[PDB]
Design a protein around this ligand. Structure first.
Ligand code: NA
Ligand code: NA
Ligand code: NA
Ligand code: NA
Ligand code: NA
Ligand code: NA
Ligand code: NA
Ligand code: NA
Ligand code: NA
Lengths: 424, 422, 423, 423
């Protein structure tokens, strides 16, 4: 029934998934023509495959197309798209922001589109070279941050559709009040009622159904640390409300935080998402296990996601051996999607700071060192030292030669310095 | 006459500069109200001071605001905005392109705007912390790439204004055919006539005059390697035309390339620009000196720029001693603005490939190694390990506390893991 | 004191204005360099002057630059930038939306920037032709819709700054829950607490202070028709809460709507805004007078604003005589800014539907009818029939001639069909 | 061969079409995964059908999605996307420009996207209302302006792809130098060689091939009025070159302009496009007939396009009877696509200028006039007087109700003033 509305959806894709809406609602709200969303289809089906086939799927947050490309080239199988990074350095207000949903709601889907188009060029380049791809596929699924939905269920509906149009494979929504949204590891977090987040999630699924894509939905809870709640209207929340403490001047209720409300919320959200994620204060395998065991008593086999956050001081928290085994252990507990949210931001900022300091100190010696490290990384599959090829100069040369029946006088690669100075 | 129209311009700013237009043209084409472009003013004037006062001003191409921010944090005094990088990873078509002016003409100025807004937030953050700045200024001047002007002189005029509005300090224009534009170190370059590139330069100056800003103009010539030319109409170009070769199927003339047509074109361009740049095939200090000496014979003291290009294989061309002295030696010749065009692209792509490979193979050990290197770099001025502060969380906490008379329940830093674990 | 932080603010600009923050906060949050926002300064000051000197300033909602330009050419002295119209046909998601804050938060300021750049070209064209301007100024102040501020106080702060950078003269904010925002004339509105809307207004003022511009702030209340409220935490709202009815499933409180809670909120908002605006269900002069009288009792001389809404069926509500005098009466009560929100949308859609229907029916005859109507309007100051001049072709010719010392072979106007066929 | 690479192409679609590239080139340049461009396919296929089954397809230039929507509602079957209008009031530099390819190369396709998304919304609304559609389809094909391709063949290739991504059905390219592009009815036009324009056209076709869509390509020639030429390298152009006049200071050759070079260029372009278009200085049926006949002699049955330009002063050129039959006569000669380029601009500007003038004079009487005209137009299928429904408020209410299983408290239509006052 829903399978006939989402024809690319694989067998069993919606096992255990509940929807507030009917299949007739979907048809009534689809409009009258079939529009295909190819990259979203492929990405969602490949993600679904990967999380059921791998020990675990691990990703890094990409703030640019080029970043994503190198992740796939290095052999990673998924890309994470961080709202935090979007805020910091890649949003549609062209500003640097903290992670508080301050940027315009279109910014995340615009970055998803950029990432897919860079992966597309990479694919075109290798296809045109005629020797096979250097990766399994350039179209690694993107799991993308929709934050708190940017307001109400209609806002969640809209950003879900925008991510699908951009070609995202999975999207995550958290039970925070959008107007007070924070980074998971910042203070000042405000939860919305269990029912209200279930609305966001159903809105996301209605968006996917109407677009006709089996897009994955990740439900996130921020209840491990949050001590505020907008309303106690939901009886599932009331046991955690500290009534003696009274409301804040904003009218927020105050709540008991920790693993317990995370477990209750996750169990309530489970039927309305494909993966469940709980934010934590520390990289704590024991806590990760307790959460997974409690969810799995209610919902055996439910797939989980885990943020390996740069907001944790890793070696302050853990010894080298536990750090080394961390993701493998999490995978065996059922955390099949694991991501370093701010990997791109830290890599970009650290790397350019060190380059710039070296350059300041020793000028071209500092740059030659980077280039020599680039040459040495070629044995490991790095290609970008030859930057003209990397970005598609050779592909466009071939476009021009096809347009002109081989006759163009103005092709790029042949008399280039890349060709003359960058041979084996 | 032009000083009155550009109130911020410093003394001697326009010495030796000629213009095709008059001061009356400017008043006529400028509208009836005064609109200020404060970052463009501050930047141009600061770039002007720097290139005169320092031995040389060296820069790195920035593809994002965060990159520019660390460049300035590290002590660099200027930012280069590369069109190549705009094309690769930061354009308004959301596409990856080779360096051929394929992206929309607005993309460069949009990135200049991003960079200035990031620097703005950095300055806001430190200002609010109230212990003074960690740098001389966050507003390091931006020297930006306008490629071949993106078409005719009106296109050159428009991208110059856009860059002024975005807050660039200086903008470069090159004597290639915009519809066949290439990276200087690609083949297939086609030159335009000398006169035509002087129209582009004059378009750019008229834009700055009409905006009322003392924005710098950098004239680039691609004559060292280019073997094609659109038209032989300009007698100054005719001695380099290979009239024995005949025109190409497109109607292009074939020309004799090298240092000689570069010198001739430079000397012709010098009155219509502030700095002069010749693209080279190899990083060749002897060639650079020969160019500088020829230009300085006609135009003593003319400021020059130099592309320390990643499109060169540095260790293949040079020994370690020469690499080490390279920029210092260039500066002594008058190359006061020197820049590594693709620094940002190479840093970003190398750094992520290696992190991604480490992560695939060793998961969190590879990331914890990065974090540890970040902590180690703090002794030398790195701050970004503490990511919440870096992007302005403390600043926005301060804005909220002001709005609410100190009462907000939902400030972010106090109960953050950043405060607890860093 | 605050006048030093905002050098262009005229004498008396901030009489009666209270601020939650201090002058030191502003200096602390401003950054270290001086950046000028020239069109924002000019627009704010000119708007401030107009609303104190004119019987009333009336405007229409522009959904494009060309629209704005003809408003100014026609002799209107202000421009209204409608969020409804942004949603409908001019936003940064490139979608058609109903008026429910569904579009990205940057869209209105982006439209502000479009309007001001069109006006700038208008002014460049006429400056270059050398015979003076055909209007008092092309830079008619823009009063722009910031809706419910797109979230909490920091979002209000950010959209205010964005409108300032775009050159808006004034910005309005309303006491609705951003996440459930509606057009004032739709059902299902949810109010925020009086105090929370004061937080938004204060955010807006901190934004202007930090930018250093005397931008006008219009406080809007939607309490005439809104029957829902997020929280009863503010004692000021409690007299209007229906505690018998219970909360909805979302947890909203239900409230008793109408003029009374509008008056209470207006009086509370007054010290934190420059103009006050109450949405109404019907175009009613008597209710307008009641509101004005009550506000002026608490705050004598307070400037007010009034939405002459297309969401009203005008002839159903009012006779021709009342329609005719309607804005003049509002002016004498203190409604010094008055605006038809959806003016641009209705003229654009009606116009093109009728042209398209004529075209289907009669092809070129329907277009020629429009063209002759254009020629006839020239006697009343219309110019756009000569579309090449209108958009700046002669100005860019003059730029090319300046660049080429008069010698360019490729100027546009001399051999154009416009020069030959429109004499 | 090319039919398997473009699966949606109907039988005979590429009859007579030549390509410089091979089917193997397409496969090499296409990437390894199939990406679908649904609106581009449906658009192209419908346009192809319409131009073979209608006497002619007539369209108007839309500068906004709302304008396009009313054109489809009024019963027009295609939409024209004008670059001139993008320049004027709808581009990605947020500026007013003359028609000289000054705006960034992405602006046209961004507008194509807006137009198709508005049409999509109109379709969603009617589908949700369950009474069937009020039009044959909402997805009227868009014929879009690619100007001179914005540079070289690679720029043409890219703008073609972008238009296909935005859902355009057909795209037009002209044989002008992109760096000196003008409106066909401005002076200062510079042509490129016949060969160079053929490269642009093949670029466009390779783009469509690579995207896997049967997108229509319209070749435009500007040779009727152009007196300049970049290069005489192409022997096909040399008979029109006035060698005795010499070159201009820019290096341009000087050419004899008129019907003759247009005929030679069209005949050379024919195999590389689906429709041919000649810009003209006047709406001249005799000249139209002469061009059609000369083209049909070399290529029988070639479909043609004609610009019914507002740059012509219609009644100055023609009597009412010729105006009335103009399009029908063109249609019988083989001009199967006809378009009024600046219809959206002149309607938007005339309409707002007049509304604003009346508003200045008479305030709400002038708006009530518009609102009453709108009510009166409802008998002929106008609907936007009920603006809340028109932009999708009813549809989003239905979305909210589905999400919340009938329970939302905050739906908009029921308690709206539209429901109460526009019965
Ligand atoms: Na996030
Ligand atoms: Na927000
Ligand atoms: Na460049
Ligand atoms: Na180009
Ligand atoms: Na509004
Ligand atoms: Na919203
Ligand atoms: Na055009
Ligand atoms: Na151009
Ligand atoms: Na001849």
């Amino acid at each position: 029934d829903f399978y006939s509305l989402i024809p690319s959806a694989p067998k069993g894709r919606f096992d255990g998934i509940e929807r507030a809406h009917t299949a007739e609602d979907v048809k009534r709200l689809r409009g009258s023509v079939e529009i295909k969303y190819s990259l979203a289809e492929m990405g969602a089906n490949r993600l679904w495959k990967l999380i059921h086939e791998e020990d675990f799927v691990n990703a890094l947050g990409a703030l640019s197309g080029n970043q994503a490309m190198q992740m796939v080239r290095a052999g990673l199988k998924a890309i994470y798209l961080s709202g935090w990074q979007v805020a910091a350095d890649a949003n549609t207000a062209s500003a640097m922001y903290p992670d508080q949903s301050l940027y315009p709601a279109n910014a995340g889907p615009e970055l998803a589109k950029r990432i897919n188009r860079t992966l597309q060029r990479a694919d075109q380049i290798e296809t045109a070279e005629g020797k096979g791809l250097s990766v399994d596929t350039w179209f690694a699924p993107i799991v993308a941050d929709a934050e708190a939905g940017f307001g109400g269920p209609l806002d969640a509906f809209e950003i879900m559709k925008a991510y699908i149009e951009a070609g995202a494979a999975g999207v995550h929504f958290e039970d925070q009040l959008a107007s007070e949204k924070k980074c998971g590891h910042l203070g000042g977090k405000v939860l919305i009622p269990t029912a209200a987040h279930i609305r966001n999630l159903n809105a996301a699924r209605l968006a996917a159904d109407v677009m006709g894509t089996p897009t994955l939905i990740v439900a996130r809870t921020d209840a491990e640390a949050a001590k505020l709640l907008t309303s106690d209207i939901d009886e599932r929340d009331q046991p955690f409300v500290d009534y003696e403490a009274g409301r804040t001047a904003e009218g927020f209720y105050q709540v008991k935080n920790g693993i317990e409300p995370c477990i209750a919320r996750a169990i309530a959200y489970a039927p309305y998402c494909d993966l469940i994620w709980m934010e934590t204060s520390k990289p704590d395998l024991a806590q990760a296990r307790r959460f997974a065991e409690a969810v799995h008593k209610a919902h055996p086999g439910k797939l989980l996601a885990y943020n390996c956050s740069p907001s944790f001081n890793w070696k302050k928290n853990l010894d080298d051996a536990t750090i080394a085994k961390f993701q493998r252990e999490l995978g065996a507990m059922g955390y099949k999607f694991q991501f370093i949210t701010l990997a791109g931001f830290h890599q970009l900022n650290y790397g350019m700071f060190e380059l710039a300091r070296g350059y300041k100190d020793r000028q071209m010696a500092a740059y030659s060192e980077l280039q020599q490290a680039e040459f040495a990384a070629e044995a490991d599959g790095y290609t970008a030292t030859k930057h003209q090829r990397e970005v598609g100069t050779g592909y466009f040369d071939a476009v021009s030669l096809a347009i002109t029946g081989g006759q163009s006088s103005t092709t790029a690669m042949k008399e280039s310095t890349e060709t003359a100075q960058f041979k084996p």
